[PDB]
């Protein structure tokens, strides 16, 4: 198999209902004051191989 | 700050500190923690640090 086909998705503050998709696929910032005080910063990608 | 063979200890406790303040903080390198969510911290009691 590809070393990096599969992705796990490290995402929080969003806890799911059961049977929920999770398909939105966004580098995970905020534009606000709680990412370093400024926007683009903090900007993880969720998904890690 | 001592060498890395020779790295400083410190005992601390019996305190009131508030970590939401310093996770805000964007002098730092890299600030990322294990196991435990660092928006939570204001929630837990310890018996040292």
Redesign the interface.
Known sequence: GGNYNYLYRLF??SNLKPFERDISTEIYQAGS??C???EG?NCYFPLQS | FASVYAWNRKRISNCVADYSVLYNSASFSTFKCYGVSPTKLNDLCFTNV
Do not use: D, L
């Open positions: 929080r503050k004051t709680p370093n005080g400024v910063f």
